[PDB]
Every structure is written in structure tokens, then in C-alpha cells.
């Protein structure tokens, strides 16, 4: 067994963790759901706000998951398994470094809200996309405001509450 390795503990700048509920294939796709570096930095600027994860960020009507911010004492430790083969035998050596101090962690604990897709159902049960209509995605007033179209009016958030209630088919006299 090798000896302990001295580690360059930078303490250079603090680091902030987002415990993103997912496996990040590519960071270019994960970051837009947190609202990007602009988003998480603004939410780091006011601890009374909560970090909101929009699992379907291309859809304006995606109601988000909300984070709870917490303090923590944590470090990011890059191990470098400097591997070798030498006369011949394979060999392993370690370098390692601690890149910063992680003071803060965001944990996603509030359940995802109710979500309602941008599709109207006529009483005949056929589904009609308003994504072709309401997204305003072409800037030249693509949703021409006077047009006869379904009303599609989801409440701003379908619930204030992201935690389960203590109800269990339980009455009380109170």
C-alpha cells in the first residue's frame, strides 16, 4: 500500500453544487433545464428564492421542480490515477488535487407540480395542438390575437404545495 499524498488544497474560490436529478450525458443539454449559468447564479444571489428545474424547458407551460438550498462543508477532489507499465510490469501512482471548497448545496426535494400539455381536447375527444399556435415562436405575432381558437388558460402554478399532506383517511375531533 502506498503512502499518503500531499494535496494542493487551493481554497481558491468557493464552489456551489446543484444536485441535478438526472444523469448528464452532455452538459449542453442539462444546463438549459436549470436555466443555465445565468439562472443558477441569480438564484445563488438571493437565498429566499428557490432553484427551479424545468424538466421540459422547451415548453413554456412546464411547471418546474423547486429546490431547497442548504449549507454544507464539502470539497471537490480530482483523483488522477497516473497509471504505468514498467520493466515488464504494470504500475499505478496517484496525483490528486482539491480544486475548491463547496460551501453550498441545492437539493431538489419539492415534487414536480401538476403539468398540463398545450393540447385542447374537443368534446369529440380529438386532440388539437396549440403548440402550432400559442408559442409566439415566430416573432411576427405568430399567434394572431383575434383568431378563433380554444381557450387554454392553465393556472400560474397548479399547486402552492410541493410536499405531501399528513392525511391518511384520518379524521379528528380537534
Amino acid at each position: 500500500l502506498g503512502a499518503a499524498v500531499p494535496v494542493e488544497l487551493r481554497r481558491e474560490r468557493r464552489m456551489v453544487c446543484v444536485e441535478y436529478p438526472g444523469v448528464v450525458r452532455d452538459v449542453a443539454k442539462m444546463l438549459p433545464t436549470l436555466g443555465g449559468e445565468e439562472g443558477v447564479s441569480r438564484i445563488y444571489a438571493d437565498p429566499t428564492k428557490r432553484l427551479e428545474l424545468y424538466f421540459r424547458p422547451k415548453d413554456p407551460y412546464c411547471h418546474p421542480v423547486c429546490a431547497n438550498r442548504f449549507s454544507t462543508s464539502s470539497l471537490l477532489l480530482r483523483i488522477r490515477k497516473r497509471t504505468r507499465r514498467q520493466k515488464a510490469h504494470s504500475e499505478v501512482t496517484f496525483d490528486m488535487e482539491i480544486l475548491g471548497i463547496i460551501s453550498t448545496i441545492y437539493k431538489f426535494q419539492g415534487m414536480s407540480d401538476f403539468q398540463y400539455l398545450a393540447v385542447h381536447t374537443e368534446a369529440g375527444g380529438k386532440h388539437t395542438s396549440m403548440y402550432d399556435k400559442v408559442l409566439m415562436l415566430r416573432p411576427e405575432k405568430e399567434a394572431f390575437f383575434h383568431q378563433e381558437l380554444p381557450l387554454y388558460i392553465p393556472p400560474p402554478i397548479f399547486s402552492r404545495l410541493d410536499a405531501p399532506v399528513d392525511y391518511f383517511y384520518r379524521p379528528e375531533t380537534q
Partner: protein, 102 residues
């Protein structure tokens, strides 16, 4: 003869320590041992921490503080699937293995 790099970005998180400023101050001694075993050990300002590797359930995404000339901002820097969960140890010169009291 031959040399090669293999790496992983183990997030280390510490516990059994409160109202601390250790990480801001401890650099005077900063050492790691047994890092590839099942129970690696961290020595930090001659405090000693022990733990096990754990998968992050989500991906832990790590951002660096940055500054605009001042205002704090973040940049993405790392992501990691793997994490190290640590507890402050107690020592007494007397054996094998860290004793964990349930």
C-alpha cells in the same frame, strides 16, 4: 516504458463538524491515503475523516464562483456521478479498520 492517465472527480462531503471554518483554514496540512481502497482516509489540519464511496443519485453538478469587476457569478466546471461521504474520526493510540459505532 508506459504511462497513462485515469481520473475521476470524487466529490467529498464532511460531517460530524459544526460551526466550522476548517476548510478555509486547514491547508497547513492536507493529505489523503488509501484513496483506492473501500474506506479511504482524509487527513485535514490533522483532523481525520473516514467514509465510503457513494454514487450520487442525481449527477452532482459543481459550479465555480467567479467575479465581475464587484459581483459574484457562477460558471459550470464539473459534473460527477460519484461522491465520498465522510465522518470526523476520534483517535487514541492503542488493530485494523475504523470502528463505526452504529
Amino acid at each position: 516504458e508506459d504511462e497513462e492517465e485515469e481520473e475521476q472527480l470524487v466529490l467529498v462531503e464532511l460531517s460530524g463538524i459544526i460551526d466550522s471554518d476548517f476548510l478555509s483554514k486547514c491547508e497547513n496540512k492536507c493529505k489523503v491515503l488509501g484513496i483506492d481502497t473501500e474506506r479511504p482516509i482524509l487527513q485535514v489540519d490533522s483532523c481525520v475523516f473516514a467514509g465510503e464511496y457513494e454514487d450520487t443519485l442525481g449527477t452532482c453538478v459543481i459550479f465555480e464562483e467567479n467575479v465581475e469587476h464587484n459581483k459574484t457569478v457562477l460558471k459550470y466546471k464539473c459534473h460527477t456521478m460519484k461522491k465520498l461521504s465522510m465522518t470526523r474520526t476520534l483517535l487514541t493510540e492503542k488493530i485494523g479498520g475504523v470502528e463505526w459505532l452504529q
